[PDB]
User: Fold this.
Amino acid sequence: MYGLVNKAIQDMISKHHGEDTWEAIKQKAGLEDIDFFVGMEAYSDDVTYHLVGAASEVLGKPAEELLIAFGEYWVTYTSEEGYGELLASAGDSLPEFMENLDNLHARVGLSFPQLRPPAFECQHTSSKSMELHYQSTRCGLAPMVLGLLHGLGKRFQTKVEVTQTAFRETGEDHDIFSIKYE
Ligand code: HEM
Assistant:
């Protein structure tokens, strides 16, 4: 994944646990070769997996718990690191933002030529609810989606409930989330 993601994980950890813990995690991930992450450069996905793996061990939290926190964090972090306007242009309510998600990543795709974005499809069920379909070339990021969704609730001062109803891991085609909103 592009360095932007790894910088943000690094950032999240450092803001919450200081530079000491970060160097520990960096060490255990097998990444002391790397002085700093470069925002617009492509890294091996393994760099992120090893990062989440390490932070899990060092912090005593499960990976999935961290993916959830990171998901929330990403919504705030992107607006402060170059992407406020793009976010503002993706909608002024959660259901709208979700519809615009593939379009948003297309936009990002222009700056980031090697992007491997997720695909998201909304099937509405009422004015307060929807099925979100999440398809990816990567495994086990569904917990991140959950956090992103809550991050967006926080963004649009909107109450959301998110429940995964289908799991790649059980053998289903793709992850599906049922979502209810204010
Ligand atoms: C301006 C805001 C955003 C930017 C700049 C951005 C950019 C990115 C980038 C660079 C990646 C890594 C993909 C790669 O390197 O191949 C990514 C991944 C991802 N993004 Fe976004 N993103 C934004 C907002 C969002 C939001 C709000 C969601 C909410 C669903 C989202 C969903 C995801 C997911 C689930 C992934 C994991 C990749 C995968 O599933 O394979 N993104 N995004």
Remarks:
- The CA atoms of residues 116 and 131 lie 23 Å apart.
- Strands lie at 119-126, 129-135, 160-166, 175-181.
